[PDB]
Amino acid sequence: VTSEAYVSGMLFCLGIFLSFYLLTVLLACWFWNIATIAVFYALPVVQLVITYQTVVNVTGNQDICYYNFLCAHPLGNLSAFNNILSNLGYILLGLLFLLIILQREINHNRALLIPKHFGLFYAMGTALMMEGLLSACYHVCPNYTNFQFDTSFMYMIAGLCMLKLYQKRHINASAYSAYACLAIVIFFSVLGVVFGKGNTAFWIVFSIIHIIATLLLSTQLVDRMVLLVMGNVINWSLAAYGLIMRPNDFASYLLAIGICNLLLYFAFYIIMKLRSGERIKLIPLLCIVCTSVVWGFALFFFFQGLSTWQKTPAESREHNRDCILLDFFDDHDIWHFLSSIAMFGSFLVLLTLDDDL
Amino acid sequence: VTSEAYVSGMLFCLGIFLSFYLLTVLLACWFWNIATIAVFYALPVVQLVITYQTVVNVTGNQDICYYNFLCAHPLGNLSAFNNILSNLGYILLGLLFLLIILQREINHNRALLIPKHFGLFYAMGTALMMEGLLSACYHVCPNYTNFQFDTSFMYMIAGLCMLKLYQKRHINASAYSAYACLAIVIFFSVLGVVFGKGNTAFWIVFSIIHIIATLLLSTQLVDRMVLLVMGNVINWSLAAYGLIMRPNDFASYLLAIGICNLLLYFAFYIIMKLRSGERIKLIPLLCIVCTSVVWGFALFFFFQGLSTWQKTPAESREHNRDCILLDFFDDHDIWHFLSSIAMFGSFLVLLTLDDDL
């Protein structure tokens, strides 16, 4: 491809994210526990990517990294520059969550001169920026040994989102455990997935754990009892689909479980708000819809399965598909563009949810 | 070598460590923060070792793992079974630290029916057992990408040892930071060591950091002021030796720094105890000598440099040396046998230090 496509791809990416900065300025005119934990986690992964990428460059063997070889545009020593550039949204849009919460915080403090706790919002903010660093470093050379943290970080942010929801009636102690508990889950998944080919035991044990975990989570949290029963029933239905069909790896299923439960959890809080006399303001109501519709495609684009690290590298090249957007970006890049906006709307639902009170 | 040497090596290893169990029975007749932190750290390292070891077995290329090929005895699919078996002391002798502290704890509770806090001793106990798992897993296939945690864990235990010393006048909050701070130091070392060949900047920046860190540590902690000045002077002398000579990698130096400072820190507490009217009991006085003499050889055996991951694998094979002990164990194995006992005596110095009061 020509260098113009590079310029068009850069201008398109910057144009989308700078439009949110312009919109927030027009509207205005009208802690480190999670950061330290994955700094422990990401850095050993960072070295492996650099070491493996150098091997591919000098050895000539292209069976190491699980790229999208039909559409992967290089620059310098990098083999897929578009896949690294696709995460630019996490940095710019994730940072934009800091100014909006900080602008609220300074307005709150000036005015003083629903519980108010802006600390956890900053934790989600630096969590989204750590996408733009680690998820960029992962894509330099994707591999099984280096896979998990590209999508495991999504769960950490997803869990934190859940924590503030639980903090509706009330944070620091549970945040460390949530990052710590999810770190354990990542490796417990890796241990079972070592024998992933024909892992019938994991197909059953995970379902039993899933049923037990949902009940305990429901128990810890008439309308509530009936509502959690329905959530358990559909959760068992999704697990039954995973146990019966088994069309993708467990890794695809875990991300599928988290987003649907989050959307269910997002929806459920509205049910209490809708059943009660409280009326949802226009902004959260649009935001809930706007967040949900964007999460719709993001799930659709994730289930495409461009590359598979379950099988041999020769078999994974079967699922490569050419660039679709501006002849520079592929389906996984569209996932980054849409998972960034979907998560941005996910926060803005939380920030503006209880403003009516 | 014949299978007898396997039997003699197993009986020798078990005979040494079971002698401590017999001795403790004869004498008697006469939390999870650190555990969770490196479970996050060790497991990604565990996968890399298994993945790399399988590659060596099937590819035939022996340039991946930095073994001691002159003396490395296989069993099953494992390439150096003696190096894995050498860590057996950490499990048996490290576990022995749990019974002695638990036997004291149950005696303390029965009698009740110097501050008493047995929790941190349990943390050191499970730290020593985590040597027997991770340091065993590391030696299955040693490599640069997997190097750090084999000796980085020593620092964590070393730091905890320091914490109880600081707890003389008084724990949980600092333990997490100490493990967290050391996790950062590991990767900050790895980042600089990427350009280790001719890293003149790291040769100077580390010395300045070393000088600043010692002063701040001294400041946080007439006799005290003069004593810390002498400790700083000799610490600057060791750094000056590292900056001038540069005969080994930084990795060898960092372990050298920790043990000497620990022994200095061990010695210094005696100076306050000796200057004061308190008289050291016979057991700690022998234990201080017995711990120190064993740490003497352990430093000597560590500086041998059997394998070097700084250079190419062809150059590292130059420093291989045959088995010395029972035709089964090499110098690094003797390090494991002596670093286990030296650390066991290191704890027993702490446990029995303040019994006279």
Author numbering:
A (entry chain B), B (entry chain A): 288 to 317, 450 to 532, 543 to 599, 602 to 652, 686 to 821
Sentences reproduced from the published study:
Human SIDT1 and SIDT2 are closely related members of the SID-1 transmembrane family, and have been implicated in various biological processes such as glucose and lipid metabolism, innate immunity, and tumorigenesis. Here, we present the cryo-electron microscopy (cryo-EM) structures of human SIDT1 and SIDT2. Both structures reveal an overall architecture of a dimeric arrangement composed of an extracellular domain (ECD) rich in β-strands and a transmembrane domain (TMD) with 11 passes, highlighting the remarkable structural congruence. Importantly, the ECDs of SIDT1 and SIDT2 bind synthetic plant-derived miRNA only under acidic conditions.
The TMDs of both proteins consist of 11 transmembrane helices and feature two pairs of conserved disulfide bonds that are essential for structural integrity. Notably, both SIDT1 and SIDT2 exhibit a potential zinc-binding site with three histidine residues within TMDs, which is responsible for lipid hydrolytic activity. Regarding the TMD, while the overall arrangement is similar in both SIDT1 and SIDT2, different transmembrane helices (TMs) contribute to dimerization. In contrast, SIDT2 relies more on interactions between TM2 and TM6 for dimerization. The electron density maps exhibited well-defined main-chain connectivity and side-chain densities in the ECDs, while the TMDs have relatively lower quality and resolution. Overall, while the ECD structure exhibits consistency, the individual helices of the TMD in SID-1 transmembrane family members show flexibility, highlighting the dynamic nature of these proteins in performing specific functions in membranes.
